[PDB]
Each structure stands twice: as C-alpha cells, then as structure tokens.
Amino acid sequence: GRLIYTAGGYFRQSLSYLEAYNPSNGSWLRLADLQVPRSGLAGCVVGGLLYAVGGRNNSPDGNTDSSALDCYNPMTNQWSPCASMSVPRNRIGVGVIDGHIYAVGGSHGCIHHSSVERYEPERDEWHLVAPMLTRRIGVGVAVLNRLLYAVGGFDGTNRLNSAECYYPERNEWRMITPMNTIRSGAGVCVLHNCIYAAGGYDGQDQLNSVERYDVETETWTFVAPMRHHRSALGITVHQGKIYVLGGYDGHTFLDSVECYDPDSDTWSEVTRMTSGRSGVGVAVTMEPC
C-alpha cells in the first residue's frame, strides 16, 4: 500500500502503540492502540487488513506470552480479535503465502517451538503444518517465489546461523546454506531474488552487518552494514527499499529508522520513531480513515 505500520514493541515494558509512517512526506500518525500490549510480535498484511501475531506482554503485573491474532482495519481504525493460534509464540516470525499467514517458532515460557501453523482468513482458522527441523525463537521469516524461509534465531541453547525452507506442496522443511553470521532477532525480508538478514544478536554483541541469500546461487553475501548495530529490529520493504525500525544496540532502545538502497549499496537515516523501542511488528498497507 502506502504506509509503514509499526505495532507494539518494548521499552521498559511491552507497548500498545500502533503508528504509521509515510515515506512520501516523512509524517507519523498515531492510530488505535492494540487491545493488549505486546513485544516480540510480528506484523503482516493480507487483503488490506493488518495482522498482529503472537508476542508477549512483559508488564509489572506479570508476563504473558501471546497466542493472539488481532485484525486491524485501516478503513475503520479498529482492532478486532481474530482466531488465536494453537500455542503462545513470543519472538515469533511470520510469512504470507497465497493469502495465508504462517506463524513460525517463537517461545512459550522455556518452550522453544519448532512448530509452524497456517491461518486462513476466509475461514478464520489456524492449522498446524510440518514443524521446522530446528527450534527457533527470534526467527527471521521471509517469502520468495511462494516458498517460506526461517532464518537464524535461538534454539534454547545456541544462537543460530542456520536457515531452512518450507515447500508447501510437499509440506516439508529442508535446510538451506547457513548464513555467514550467527543472528538471533535479525530483521529478515525479501528484495528482488534475495533474502536479506540485517542485524541481530549472537549472544555477545548486537550486529550492524547485513547479508543476503540468492536463491539461484544458494550463497550468502554481505552488503553494506547498517549505520546502527541492532537486535530485535522491525523490517519491511516499501517501494524496492528495505526499512529497518528500532531495536536494541546494547545501550539504547533505538528510535532510528534506516533505509537501504540496493542500487547504491547504502544505508541512510530516514526518520525517527516517536520513541525508542525494540521487538516491534511491522508491515505495509493503505493509509487509514
């Protein structure tokens, strides 16, 4: 559509913010709060509805992992509950294929999920599909050529450089070439024929490095690093440019929004979020009201 939507996130506690950024004019709008605060969620769009998926409410009244799927209609500026997932999934990744949402990995307490389930908007129903070969939380997910990729994350013991691909018509996961960098809570998206993995956490440092996987060559190649180190960033694509939003640099919960131009191989500062935050869900759709 036209706007980059950021939903939820974390600063001191989980957040309920929904705000939309307009690349055309640099403006931010605050829209209807989520019904429940959540960090570690993912955002996606299907048929002009924005979806907030999974996460956890980290609050002083207690911490609760979320199995929620909530539906935002930009036409009405209202959130409605949609069907809940089979399980809570904090630090989730999601991908859309053929109008269906795949919820991938994430955690529930000390449970690190390998499980994957698929939502059908037409039926408001989730169904489990084949689990990943690896347990992954903080998992990056992208879709390219109607195949679903799960990239990096944390399996309960180790942060991962591994990645795998789901073939829907085979209901089967297979490993792909591992990344050159261990990344948990990277931003993962697709641009042209490539899966990008930006930033993340390796268990010691937050990362500025960025690498991309070419499905034709099966190789990962580093591109220019981001201006900021960041883990638990939000990421999206708007008109052939990658945007990264917020995250944590080991010192600050960033308000920084950076954009990548693949033609010049450069990252630039674009705007600041209205306040610093990590673990947001991000997606692109039409302007509201």
Which residues would be at the binding site for ligand XYY (CB under 6 A)?
10, 39-40, 91, 138, 154, 159, 184-185, 201, 206, 231-232, 248, 278-279
**What's the rounded Cα separation, in Å, for the pair 209 and 267?**
11
Nearer to ligand XYY, 279 or 288 (CB): 279
Closest distance of CB 10 from ligand XYY, Å = 3
Nearer to ligand XYY, 23 or 53 (CB): 53
Give the Cα-Cα-Cα angle 159, 161, 163 (nearest 5 degrees).
115
Nearer to Cl ion, 145 or 157 (CB): 157
**How many of the chain's residues bind Cl ion (CB under 5 A)?**
1
Closest distance of CB 107 from Cl ion, Å = 8
Closest distance of CB 117 from ligand XYY, Å = 19
Nearer to ligand XYY, 44 or 232 (CB): 232
β-partners of residue 49 are: 46
Closest distance of CB 55 from Cl ion, Å = 8
Give the Cα-Cα-Cα angle 235, 258, 24 (nearest 5 degrees).
90
Strands (E), 161-274: 163-167, 172-176, 187-191, 194-198, 210-214, 219-222, 234-238, 241-245, 256-261, 266-272
Nearest residue by C-beta to Cl ion? Answer: 40
10 binds, among Cl ion, ligand XYY, none (CB under 5 to 8 A by kind): ligand XYY
Nearer to ligand XYY, 23 or 138 (CB): 138
Closest distance of CB 74 from ligand XYY, Å = 24
187 binds, among Cl ion, ligand XYY, none (CB under 5 to 8 A by kind): none
Nearest residue by C-beta to ligand XYY? Answer: 279
Task: Starting at the earlier edge strand, list the strands of the sheet with 187-191.
Answer: 187-191, 194-198, 210-214, 219-222
Per-residue tokens: 188: 């993962």
288 binds, among ligand XYY, Cl ion, none (CB under 5 to 8 A by kind): none
Closest distance of CB 38 from ligand XYY, Å = 9
Nearer to ligand XYY, 23 or 187 (CB): 187
Nearest to 139 by CA among 171, 166, 114, 108: 114
Strands (E), 76-124: 78-81, 93-97, 100-104, 107-108, 111-112, 116-120
201 binds, among Cl ion, ligand XYY, none (CB under 5 to 8 A by kind): ligand XYY
**What's the rounded Cα separation, in Å, for the pair 128 and 42?**
18
**What's the rounded Cα separation, in Å, for the pair 274 and 256?**
10
Closest distance of CB 34 from Cl ion, Å = 16
Which three-class secondary structure state does DSSP give residue 251?
A: coil
Beta-carbon contacts of residue 9 (< 8 Å; ≥ 6 apart)? 15, 17, 39, 234, 246, 277, 278, 279, 280, 281
CB 128 within 8 A of CB 116: yes
Nearer to Cl ion, 276 or 288 (CB): 276
Residues between 31 and 50 with contacts to Cl ion, criterion CB under 5 A: 40
Q: Can you give the binding site for Cl ion, defined by CB under 5 A? A: 40
